[PDB]
RNA sequence: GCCGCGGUAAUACGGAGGGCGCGAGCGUUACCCGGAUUCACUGGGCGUAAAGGGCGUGUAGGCGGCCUGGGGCGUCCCAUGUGA
RNA sequence: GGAGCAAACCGGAUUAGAUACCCGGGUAGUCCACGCCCUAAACGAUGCGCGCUAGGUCUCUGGGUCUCCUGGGGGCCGAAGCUA
RNA sequence: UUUAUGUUUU
């Protein structure tokens, strides 16, 4: 069913990273890859590879975590601590170029879809465009 | 020399717990048959290898290992193998706090020395017929839980646990203190909180005597002069 | 307008000599020499661990009392400092210093901040050649402060100009003692001015 | 070297036949203003005694406070229980804006310039525990990249 | 003003001495915003705190899977007019 | 339509009183047809659809190359996470 | 199988 294909993805990722899983399968779309790209290019994921489950197209996403820690709760930090949908189907969110977000003072990325393609808070400010604002990650 | 083959690992060192598992134990598990999960012994190598690397490095800088198992299987194979190393150990019940509270539980060690002197001495017979039996009985059990803990009046940089689940207390006790934790862990528990992992049967004495035995050897070698086989087979099968 | 009546209750109260005085607060009394405790029936009783607000209040009042300024004005200047680009602690301190009545003290044409007040409102002062009687008046870099023409007599002036020799005036200030006059050279940088105050708190006060 | 300011002393009471037996508890902060802070909650039968373990426990739990020039690296929001603290960095020359609890902690840790608000439950005990966790979770441009590279 | 003070030792009432805050002003009353993420777009909720419709079927409305073109309505960019 | 039961009502007890509790009676109603009423602790006090996040065990019911696996239900205990 | 109740403020 899946009213939001994109949000569904970022949640499958969020949920795996929580359980520390090597990868997760996230049914495939062009625009979902273009976003899945920027996640490796900026280093939140090792990367993806197109694959097949039951003759059905998927994207396997390979998950990055931090080093084993010490003290109790000997569990890795997160490469993606935070991922959530900004503009969704229920309320769509478009920002002009002067209006683009600051995410985490610059410590993090804001993925945003524009006429020049899927760009990031910087890339878009550099091209000087803006567009629909997919989500935010740190 | 040090190592172990995968041949002597066959006494029965693969699997104990069937269906009783702790699924975080996936990586080290091979296949299920006849009940019990059979635990992969090739990884047990890659680990026993990397594990020993921390033990060998530790022993030759003069640091300590603290020995724990309370089971029926792992009891007598601790006392022996532990004294032969010269390391501390816990045989009977593991007193709560023994690490996060070393301070107050060790004040109970001093009382053990205070009881040893005064056994026969220029004091005792002057204390009435009641008190003697009393004090010596306080010595009896005192020596029981605290026999092997008596050594090492400072706290170690490692512990060695037979079943990481059977004392969960300990593993977390040390973990709270930054004290590294190494143990022999079957399907019972999760790799997770154990820092240096010995993925094999933690029951079936043949396995705990074999893996602890030649693991005590590796400690003497970084000290000096690894010695002839120490008591292992007693009532064994 | 400005506060009047007993000063030494303030020298004390605050618990640090602020020299609202003439040569006296220098003598072996600021009154704070004899009795280093707050005024009234209760001064000698054992103090209470003060409220976090109580500390910010006392600090603000200290600084404010030092310049002999009415709260009406004292806050005008704090809002100014805030609206102005800067570190907002020091811009406040500079703006205070830049008062005619404060300068005419710092330059020693008169001994007390209060003596330096009546001095201006009585016509005994001049800025850039002009008669100026308003104690609230600003001075920016470059201005020439001087005693007036008809005013160079009156033992009060030259009794206090004499005693100036041997004291080194402030880096932001300069004084030619023979010609009775000075120039406001620059804004009196934080370190340039050590008051007893922690100016931080004076800000943390007005944020309610 | 270390500084002790304490935000909370309070008397609780339990009940037994014939009266309310009291006991005391204390929130204490511990830090050098170089970026090292800690917090612990002591409880014992009298105020001074409980202020003691306050300090004791305080040093047993501490954190890096990766200042950049007296502010923090980035805006952070964290929730402990029902209580929530919003931490945003301000350019030097501002002030430290917070309530008693989030100030004492933040101010012993360095941090001359910061902006904050307490939301949800303003309970001081649970607001303090949420303020440490929102410092503890801070990260700089460095540990950011040491995180995501590969290798 | 809210919690509350006064029942023969009242820092809570009344006067006094003393102190704190402002000062040609200081208080009171009324009203607006603020604190109130307490109508929550930013920024809330609904097992037991106030809050899931007694359950269905379904009109409008709202939302909507994968691939590729066309238009460019939203959106975005630049320029310019106006924005007294 | 009416056997048993039973608001109301009558009687016996109880009690200071007993318009109740206990006992003996007892009429609507309980049942049927048709037509109304539209409430409820109508409760999992938990709206519906979809995807995603360890397992253990008991049970109902299909399919299986029927020591196990697989699907849809009903229960307990529990990972991560949530919760005052 | 008989019981019901306990003035106001501290
Ligand atoms: Mg400014
Ligand atoms: Mg304000
Ligand atoms: Mg909440
Ligand atoms: Mg609240
Ligand atoms: Mg409150
Ligand atoms: Mg009287
Ligand atoms: Mg009286
Ligand atoms: Mg009285
Ligand atoms: Mg009053
Ligand atoms: Mg009075
Ligand atoms: Mg008076
Ligand atoms: Mg008076
Ligand atoms: Mg008014
Ligand atoms: Mg909302
Ligand atoms: Mg609410
Ligand atoms: Mg809901
Ligand atoms: Mg309710
Ligand atoms: Mg319902
Ligand atoms: Mg409905
Ligand atoms: Mg209805
Ligand atoms: Mg429907
Ligand atoms: Mg429709
Ligand atoms: Mg579509
Ligand atoms: Mg549509
Ligand atoms: Mg199209
Ligand atoms: Mg224009
Ligand atoms: Mg009757
Ligand atoms: Mg009767
Ligand atoms: Mg009667
Ligand atoms: Mg009754
Ligand atoms: Mg009857
Ligand atoms: Mg009947
Ligand atoms: Mg009727
Ligand atoms: Mg309801
Ligand atoms: Mg449901
Ligand atoms: Mg519904
Ligand atoms: Mg079926
Ligand atoms: Mg069958
Ligand atoms: Mg089921
Ligand atoms: Mg449960
Ligand atoms: Mg849990
Ligand atoms: Mg009555
Ligand atoms: Mg009563
Ligand atoms: Zn004085």
mmCIF file of N, CA, C and O (backbone and C1' of nucleotides) in Angstrom, chain F residues 10-54:
data_model
loop_
_atom_site.group_PDB
_atom_site.id
_atom_site.type_symbol
_atom_site.label_atom_id
_atom_site.label_comp_id
_atom_site.label_asym_id
_atom_site.label_seq_id
_atom_site.Cartn_x
_atom_site.Cartn_y
_atom_site.Cartn_z
ATOM 1 P P C F 10 -47.480 -2.903 49.556
ATOM 2 O "O5'" C F 10 -47.905 -4.389 49.948
ATOM 3 C "C5'" C F 10 -49.278 -4.727 50.058
ATOM 4 C "C4'" C F 10 -49.486 -6.168 50.446
ATOM 5 C "C3'" C F 10 -48.785 -6.636 51.706
ATOM 6 O "O3'" C F 10 -49.447 -6.235 52.887
ATOM 7 C "C1'" C F 10 -48.538 -8.256 50.001
ATOM 8 P P G F 11 -48.601 -5.979 54.222
ATOM 9 O "O5'" G F 11 -48.169 -7.450 54.644
ATOM 10 C "C5'" G F 11 -49.099 -8.326 55.251
ATOM 11 C "C4'" G F 11 -48.631 -9.756 55.203
ATOM 12 C "C3'" G F 11 -47.452 -10.111 56.088
ATOM 13 O "O3'" G F 11 -47.785 -10.244 57.449
ATOM 14 C "C1'" G F 11 -47.093 -11.020 53.977
ATOM 15 P P G F 12 -46.814 -9.618 58.560
ATOM 16 O "O5'" G F 12 -45.782 -10.798 58.828
ATOM 17 C "C5'" G F 12 -46.227 -12.128 59.025
ATOM 18 C "C4'" G F 12 -45.081 -13.098 58.972
ATOM 19 C "C3'" G F 12 -43.902 -12.780 59.868
ATOM 20 O "O3'" G F 12 -44.129 -13.150 61.218
ATOM 21 C "C1'" G F 12 -43.124 -13.383 57.724
ATOM 22 P P A F 13 -43.533 -12.265 62.423
ATOM 23 O "O5'" A F 13 -42.008 -12.683 62.431
ATOM 24 C "C5'" A F 13 -41.062 -11.903 61.740
ATOM 25 C "C4'" A F 13 -39.753 -12.620 61.593
ATOM 26 C "C3'" A F 13 -38.545 -11.890 62.188
ATOM 27 O "O3'" A F 13 -38.231 -12.343 63.497
ATOM 28 C "C1'" A F 13 -38.219 -12.228 59.877
ATOM 29 P P U F 14 -37.742 -11.313 64.637
ATOM 30 O "O5'" U F 14 -36.519 -10.556 63.937
ATOM 31 C "C5'" U F 14 -35.251 -11.187 63.800
ATOM 32 C "C4'" U F 14 -34.292 -10.364 62.968
ATOM 33 C "C3'" U F 14 -33.885 -9.009 63.532
ATOM 34 O "O3'" U F 14 -32.864 -9.101 64.521
ATOM 35 C "C1'" U F 14 -34.402 -8.810 61.221
ATOM 36 P P U F 15 -33.079 -8.456 65.985
ATOM 37 O "O5'" U F 15 -32.886 -6.888 65.724
ATOM 38 C "C5'" U F 15 -31.774 -6.413 64.973
ATOM 39 C "C4'" U F 15 -31.938 -4.971 64.520
ATOM 40 C "C3'" U F 15 -32.639 -4.010 65.473
ATOM 41 O "O3'" U F 15 -31.805 -3.586 66.536
ATOM 42 C "C1'" U F 15 -33.420 -3.656 63.264
ATOM 43 P P A F 16 -32.421 -3.238 67.983
ATOM 44 O "O5'" A F 16 -33.076 -1.798 67.762
ATOM 45 C "C5'" A F 16 -34.125 -1.340 68.610
ATOM 46 C "C4'" A F 16 -34.610 0.033 68.216
ATOM 47 C "C3'" A F 16 -35.301 0.140 66.865
ATOM 48 O "O3'" A F 16 -36.680 -0.210 66.930
ATOM 49 C "C1'" A F 16 -33.688 1.863 67.083
ATOM 50 P P G F 17 -37.313 -1.174 65.820
ATOM 51 O "O5'" G F 17 -37.429 -0.228 64.544
ATOM 52 C "C5'" G F 17 -38.474 0.758 64.447
ATOM 53 C "C4'" G F 17 -38.410 1.457 63.109
ATOM 54 C "C3'" G F 17 -38.247 0.543 61.900
ATOM 55 O "O3'" G F 17 -39.517 0.202 61.357
ATOM 56 C "C1'" G F 17 -36.537 2.172 61.888
ATOM 57 P P A F 18 -39.857 -1.325 61.020
ATOM 58 O "O5'" A F 18 -38.926 -1.635 59.766
ATOM 59 C "C5'" A F 18 -38.355 -0.568 58.987
ATOM 60 C "C4'" A F 18 -37.815 -1.104 57.683
ATOM 61 C "C3'" A F 18 -37.795 -2.626 57.556
ATOM 62 O "O3'" A F 18 -38.008 -3.020 56.205
ATOM 63 C "C1'" A F 18 -35.585 -1.802 57.459
ATOM 64 P P U F 19 -39.498 -3.169 55.640
ATOM 65 O "O5'" U F 19 -39.815 -1.715 55.071
ATOM 66 C "C5'" U F 19 -38.863 -1.020 54.244
ATOM 67 C "C4'" U F 19 -39.438 -0.793 52.866
ATOM 68 C "C3'" U F 19 -38.422 -0.471 51.776
ATOM 69 O "O3'" U F 19 -38.861 -0.972 50.519
ATOM 70 C "C1'" U F 19 -39.866 1.374 52.069
ATOM 71 P P A F 20 -37.897 -1.909 49.651
ATOM 72 O "O5'" A F 20 -37.845 -3.257 50.497
ATOM 73 C "C5'" A F 20 -36.914 -3.411 51.586
ATOM 74 C "C4'" A F 20 -35.507 -3.544 51.054
ATOM 75 C "C3'" A F 20 -34.866 -4.920 51.228
ATOM 76 O "O3'" A F 20 -35.069 -5.717 50.067
ATOM 77 C "C1'" A F 20 -33.477 -3.279 52.203
ATOM 78 P P C F 21 -34.780 -7.290 50.116
ATOM 79 O "O5'" C F 21 -33.299 -7.351 50.697
ATOM 80 C "C5'" C F 21 -32.178 -7.557 49.842
ATOM 81 C "C4'" C F 21 -30.914 -7.795 50.635
ATOM 82 C "C3'" C F 21 -30.794 -9.158 51.305
ATOM 83 O "O3'" C F 21 -30.261 -10.144 50.435
ATOM 84 C "C1'" C F 21 -30.284 -7.444 52.869
ATOM 85 P P C F 22 -31.171 -11.362 49.902
ATOM 86 O "O5'" C F 22 -31.531 -12.163 51.235
ATOM 87 C "C5'" C F 22 -30.749 -13.273 51.648
ATOM 88 C "C4'" C F 22 -31.357 -13.976 52.837
ATOM 89 C "C3'" C F 22 -32.686 -14.665 52.592
ATOM 90 O "O3'" C F 22 -32.557 -15.934 51.975
ATOM 91 C "C1'" C F 22 -32.852 -13.361 54.541
ATOM 92 P P C F 23 -33.547 -16.344 50.775
ATOM 93 O "O5'" C F 23 -34.924 -16.620 51.533
ATOM 94 C "C5'" C F 23 -35.032 -17.706 52.439
ATOM 95 C "C4'" C F 23 -36.373 -17.749 53.127
ATOM 96 C "C3'" C F 23 -37.599 -17.791 52.233
ATOM 97 O "O3'" C F 23 -37.854 -19.074 51.702
ATOM 98 C "C1'" C F 23 -37.940 -16.221 53.937
ATOM 99 P P G F 24 -38.518 -19.224 50.250
ATOM 100 O "O5'" G F 24 -40.056 -18.964 50.548
ATOM 101 C "C5'" G F 24 -40.715 -19.652 51.601
ATOM 102 C "C4'" G F 24 -42.168 -19.274 51.677
ATOM 103 C "C3'" G F 24 -42.857 -19.031 50.345
ATOM 104 O "O3'" G F 24 -43.248 -20.231 49.693
ATOM 105 C "C1'" G F 24 -43.341 -17.247 51.793
ATOM 106 P P G F 25 -43.580 -20.229 48.120
ATOM 107 O "O5'" G F 25 -44.909 -19.357 48.060
ATOM 108 C "C5'" G F 25 -45.181 -18.504 46.960
ATOM 109 C "C4'" G F 25 -46.279 -17.530 47.293
ATOM 110 C "C3'" G F 25 -46.789 -16.674 46.144
ATOM 111 O "O3'" G F 25 -47.746 -17.342 45.341
ATOM 112 C "C1'" G F 25 -46.309 -15.290 47.978
ATOM 113 P P G F 26 -47.488 -17.551 43.764
ATOM 114 O "O5'" G F 26 -47.600 -16.071 43.182
ATOM 115 C "C5'" G F 26 -48.744 -15.265 43.437
ATOM 116 C "C4'" G F 26 -48.438 -13.808 43.232
ATOM 117 C "C3'" G F 26 -47.892 -13.435 41.863
ATOM 118 O "O3'" G F 26 -48.914 -13.241 40.914
ATOM 119 C "C1'" G F 26 -46.557 -12.447 43.555
ATOM 120 P P U F 27 -48.859 -13.971 39.486
ATOM 121 O "O5'" U F 27 -48.975 -12.752 38.471
ATOM 122 C "C5'" U F 27 -50.096 -11.890 38.513
ATOM 123 C "C4'" U F 27 -49.725 -10.470 38.180
ATOM 124 C "C3'" U F 27 -48.917 -10.265 36.922
ATOM 125 O "O3'" U F 27 -49.673 -10.393 35.740
ATOM 126 C "C1'" U F 27 -48.061 -8.896 38.641
ATOM 127 P P A F 28 -48.910 -10.546 34.340
ATOM 128 O "O5'" A F 28 -48.306 -9.088 34.113
ATOM 129 C "C5'" A F 28 -47.913 -8.650 32.826
ATOM 130 C "C4'" A F 28 -47.283 -7.290 32.891
ATOM 131 C "C3'" A F 28 -46.028 -7.111 32.057
ATOM 132 O "O3'" A F 28 -46.316 -6.730 30.731
ATOM 133 C "C1'" A F 28 -45.594 -6.409 34.266
ATOM 134 P P G F 29 -45.990 -7.726 29.523
ATOM 135 O "O5'" G F 29 -44.415 -7.883 29.619
ATOM 136 C "C5'" G F 29 -43.572 -6.743 29.660
ATOM 137 C "C4'" G F 29 -42.253 -7.079 30.282
ATOM 138 C "C3'" G F 29 -41.539 -8.270 29.674
ATOM 139 O "O3'" G F 29 -40.814 -7.935 28.507
ATOM 140 C "C1'" G F 29 -41.591 -8.508 32.014
ATOM 141 P P U F 30 -40.704 -8.980 27.296
ATOM 142 O "O5'" U F 30 -39.873 -10.172 27.943
ATOM 143 C "C5'" U F 30 -38.464 -10.097 28.050
ATOM 144 C "C4'" U F 30 -37.927 -11.178 28.944
ATOM 145 C "C3'" U F 30 -37.927 -12.585 28.366
ATOM 146 O "O3'" U F 30 -36.814 -12.836 27.519
ATOM 147 C "C1'" U F 30 -38.784 -12.614 30.576
ATOM 148 P P C F 31 -36.898 -12.544 25.933
ATOM 149 O "O5'" C F 31 -37.821 -13.726 25.406
ATOM 150 C "C5'" C F 31 -37.505 -15.078 25.689
ATOM 151 C "C4'" C F 31 -38.507 -16.014 25.065
ATOM 152 C "C3'" C F 31 -39.065 -15.595 23.707
ATOM 153 O "O3'" C F 31 -38.205 -15.923 22.624
ATOM 154 C "C1'" C F 31 -40.840 -16.226 25.128
ATOM 155 P P C F 32 -38.054 -14.928 21.359
ATOM 156 O "O5'" C F 32 -39.389 -15.194 20.547
ATOM 157 C "C5'" C F 32 -39.757 -16.514 20.198
ATOM 158 C "C4'" C F 32 -41.017 -16.541 19.389
ATOM 159 C "C3'" C F 32 -41.201 -15.396 18.415
ATOM 160 O "O3'" C F 32 -40.490 -15.592 17.209
ATOM 161 C "C1'" C F 32 -43.184 -15.706 19.650
ATOM 162 P P A F 33 -39.949 -14.334 16.362
ATOM 163 O "O5'" A F 33 -41.274 -13.751 15.704
ATOM 164 C "C5'" A F 33 -42.021 -14.522 14.775
ATOM 165 C "C4'" A F 33 -43.160 -13.729 14.193
ATOM 166 C "C3'" A F 33 -42.827 -12.305 13.779
ATOM 167 O "O3'" A F 33 -42.235 -12.226 12.491
ATOM 168 C "C1'" A F 33 -44.783 -12.298 15.100
ATOM 169 P P C F 34 -40.977 -11.256 12.242
ATOM 170 O "O5'" C F 34 -41.662 -9.830 12.090
ATOM 171 C "C5'" C F 34 -42.595 -9.599 11.048
ATOM 172 C "C4'" C F 34 -43.583 -8.517 11.397
ATOM 173 C "C3'" C F 34 -43.016 -7.150 11.697
ATOM 174 O "O3'" C F 34 -42.544 -6.469 10.552
ATOM 175 C "C1'" C F 34 -44.701 -7.640 13.246
ATOM 176 P P G F 35 -41.140 -5.690 10.618
ATOM 177 O "O5'" G F 35 -41.527 -4.354 11.373
ATOM 178 C "C5'" G F 35 -42.605 -3.566 10.913
ATOM 179 C "C4'" G F 35 -43.029 -2.562 11.943
ATOM 180 C "C3'" G F 35 -41.939 -1.666 12.492
ATOM 181 O "O3'" G F 35 -41.578 -0.626 11.598
ATOM 182 C "C1'" G F 35 -43.356 -2.405 14.243
ATOM 183 P P C F 36 -40.212 0.192 11.822
ATOM 184 O "O5'" C F 36 -40.567 1.115 13.057
ATOM 185 C "C5'" C F 36 -39.613 1.358 14.066
ATOM 186 C "C4'" C F 36 -40.242 1.978 15.280
ATOM 187 C "C3'" C F 36 -39.271 2.625 16.245
ATOM 188 O "O3'" C F 36 -38.976 3.961 15.881
ATOM 189 C "C1'" C F 36 -40.751 1.191 17.429
ATOM 190 P P C F 37 -37.470 4.493 15.962
ATOM 191 O "O5'" C F 37 -37.159 4.366 17.519
ATOM 192 C "C5'" C F 37 -37.845 5.161 18.468
ATOM 193 C "C4'" C F 37 -37.476 4.764 19.867
ATOM 194 C "C3'" C F 37 -36.011 4.908 20.217
ATOM 195 O "O3'" C F 37 -35.714 6.206 20.711
ATOM 196 C "C1'" C F 37 -36.867 2.789 20.940
ATOM 197 P P C F 38 -34.406 6.993 20.209
ATOM 198 O "O5'" C F 38 -33.274 5.874 20.340
ATOM 199 C "C5'" C F 38 -32.373 5.840 21.445
ATOM 200 C "C4'" C F 38 -31.005 5.408 20.996
ATOM 201 C "C3'" C F 38 -30.519 6.128 19.729
ATOM 202 O "O3'" C F 38 -29.117 6.499 19.774
ATOM 203 C "C1'" C F 38 -30.647 3.777 19.339
ATOM 204 P P U F 39 -28.061 5.855 20.811
ATOM 205 O "O5'" U F 39 -28.529 6.429 22.210
ATOM 206 C "C5'" U F 39 -27.604 6.584 23.263
ATOM 207 C "C4'" U F 39 -27.972 5.754 24.466
ATOM 208 C "C3'" U F 39 -26.820 5.067 25.149
ATOM 209 O "O3'" U F 39 -26.084 5.950 25.960
ATOM 210 C "C1'" U F 39 -28.663 3.589 24.975
ATOM 211 P P A F 40 -24.504 6.083 25.769
ATOM 212 O "O5'" A F 40 -23.997 4.690 26.350
ATOM 213 C "C5'" A F 40 -24.104 4.454 27.741
ATOM 214 C "C4'" A F 40 -23.847 3.021 28.128
ATOM 215 C "C3'" A F 40 -22.556 2.389 27.659
ATOM 216 O "O3'" A F 40 -21.412 2.888 28.343
ATOM 217 C "C1'" A F 40 -24.343 0.819 27.597
ATOM 218 P P A F 41 -20.055 3.235 27.532
ATOM 219 O "O5'" A F 41 -18.950 2.470 28.373
ATOM 220 C "C5'" A F 41 -19.272 1.901 29.632
ATOM 221 C "C4'" A F 41 -18.538 0.610 29.849
ATOM 222 C "C3'" A F 41 -19.414 -0.631 29.978
ATOM 223 O "O3'" A F 41 -18.784 -1.718 29.316
ATOM 224 C "C1'" A F 41 -18.033 -0.426 31.877
ATOM 225 P P A F 42 -19.663 -2.762 28.487
ATOM 226 O "O5'" A F 42 -20.412 -1.831 27.429
ATOM 227 C "C5'" A F 42 -19.701 -1.158 26.398
ATOM 228 C "C4'" A F 42 -20.178 -1.598 25.034
ATOM 229 C "C3'" A F 42 -19.443 -1.025 23.834
ATOM 230 O "O3'" A F 42 -18.198 -1.656 23.599
ATOM 231 C "C1'" A F 42 -21.783 -1.027 23.437
ATOM 232 P P C F 43 -16.911 -0.772 23.248
ATOM 233 O "O5'" C F 43 -15.792 -1.391 24.197
ATOM 234 C "C5'" C F 43 -14.998 -2.490 23.765
ATOM 235 C "C4'" C F 43 -14.198 -3.079 24.895
ATOM 236 C "C3'" C F 43 -14.935 -4.110 25.748
ATOM 237 O "O3'" C F 43 -14.022 -5.109 26.181
ATOM 238 C "C1'" C F 43 -14.245 -2.316 27.105
ATOM 239 P P G F 44 -13.438 -6.168 25.134
ATOM 240 O "O5'" G F 44 -11.867 -5.891 25.190
ATOM 241 C "C5'" G F 44 -11.100 -6.240 26.339
ATOM 242 C "C4'" G F 44 -9.804 -5.469 26.410
ATOM 243 C "C3'" G F 44 -9.947 -3.963 26.639
ATOM 244 O "O3'" G F 44 -8.868 -3.504 27.463
ATOM 245 C "C1'" G F 44 -8.710 -4.345 24.683
ATOM 246 P P A F 45 -9.159 -2.740 28.856
ATOM 247 O "O5'" A F 45 -10.161 -1.582 28.411
ATOM 248 C "C5'" A F 45 -9.698 -0.512 27.588
ATOM 249 C "C4'" A F 45 -10.831 0.292 26.989
ATOM 250 C "C3'" A F 45 -10.414 1.654 26.443
ATOM 251 O "O3'" A F 45 -11.234 2.031 25.330
ATOM 252 C "C1'" A F 45 -11.824 1.920 28.367
ATOM 253 P P U F 46 -11.408 1.045 24.070
ATOM 254 O "O5'" U F 46 -10.544 1.742 22.908
ATOM 255 C "C5'" U F 46 -9.369 2.504 23.198
ATOM 256 C "C4'" U F 46 -8.262 2.301 22.169
ATOM 257 C "C3'" U F 46 -8.450 1.118 21.209
ATOM 258 O "O3'" U F 46 -7.740 1.331 19.969
ATOM 259 C "C1'" U F 46 -6.563 0.734 22.555
ATOM 260 P P G F 47 -7.602 2.786 19.288
ATOM 261 O "O5'" G F 47 -8.448 2.636 17.943
ATOM 262 C "C5'" G F 47 -9.824 2.276 17.968
ATOM 263 C "C4'" G F 47 -10.491 2.547 16.638
ATOM 264 C "C3'" G F 47 -9.849 1.886 15.430
ATOM 265 O "O3'" G F 47 -10.250 0.536 15.270
ATOM 266 C "C1'" G F 47 -10.268 4.166 14.953
ATOM 267 P P C F 48 -9.189 -0.578 14.802
ATOM 268 O "O5'" C F 48 -9.115 -0.346 13.227
ATOM 269 C "C5'" C F 48 -10.262 -0.505 12.410
ATOM 270 C "C4'" C F 48 -10.032 0.032 11.019
ATOM 271 C "C3'" C F 48 -8.802 -0.482 10.298
ATOM 272 O "O3'" C F 48 -8.969 -1.778 9.756
ATOM 273 C "C1'" C F 48 -8.917 1.851 10.050
ATOM 274 P P G F 49 -7.694 -2.747 9.577
ATOM 275 O "O5'" G F 49 -6.882 -2.037 8.400
ATOM 276 C "C5'" G F 49 -7.391 -2.043 7.076
ATOM 277 C "C4'" G F 49 -6.460 -1.364 6.098
ATOM 278 C "C3'" G F 49 -5.011 -1.816 6.097
ATOM 279 O "O3'" G F 49 -4.809 -3.064 5.454
ATOM 280 C "C1'" G F 49 -5.103 0.535 5.981
ATOM 281 P P C F 50 -3.626 -4.041 5.942
ATOM 282 O "O5'" C F 50 -2.320 -3.282 5.436
ATOM 283 C "C5'" C F 50 -2.184 -2.900 4.075
ATOM 284 C "C4'" C F 50 -0.944 -2.064 3.835
ATOM 285 C "C3'" C F 50 0.347 -2.538 4.487
ATOM 286 O "O3'" C F 50 0.940 -3.651 3.845
ATOM 287 C "C1'" C F 50 0.144 -0.225 4.801
ATOM 288 P P G F 51 1.836 -4.679 4.695
ATOM 289 O "O5'" G F 51 3.232 -3.930 4.793
ATOM 290 C "C5'" G F 51 3.968 -3.609 3.623
ATOM 291 C "C4'" G F 51 5.181 -2.771 3.947
ATOM 292 C "C3'" G F 51 6.088 -3.304 5.046
ATOM 293 O "O3'" G F 51 6.958 -4.339 4.618
ATOM 294 C "C1'" G F 51 5.663 -1.033 5.444
ATOM 295 P P C F 52 7.496 -5.428 5.679
ATOM 296 O "O5'" C F 52 8.477 -4.569 6.592
ATOM 297 C "C5'" C F 52 9.572 -3.863 6.026
ATOM 298 C "C4'" C F 52 10.264 -3.003 7.053
ATOM 299 C "C3'" C F 52 10.715 -3.713 8.325
ATOM 300 O "O3'" C F 52 11.954 -4.390 8.174
ATOM 301 C "C1'" C F 52 9.552 -1.738 8.898
ATOM 302 P P U F 53 12.350 -5.610 9.155
ATOM 303 O "O5'" U F 53 12.629 -4.870 10.542
ATOM 304 C "C5'" U F 53 13.809 -5.137 11.285
ATOM 305 C "C4'" U F 53 13.752 -4.552 12.676
ATOM 306 C "C3'" U F 53 13.370 -5.508 13.794
ATOM 307 O "O3'" U F 53 14.434 -6.352 14.203
ATOM 308 C "C1'" U F 53 12.158 -3.511 14.044
ATOM 309 P P A F 54 14.688 -7.764 13.470
ATOM 310 O "O5'" A F 54 13.683 -8.749 14.216
ATOM 311 C "C5'" A F 54 13.617 -8.786 15.627
ATOM 312 C "C4'" A F 54 14.583 -9.786 16.188
ATOM 313 C "C3'" A F 54 14.100 -11.224 16.260
ATOM 314 O "O3'" A F 54 14.135 -11.902 15.013
ATOM 315 C "C1'" A F 54 15.133 -10.650 18.294
#
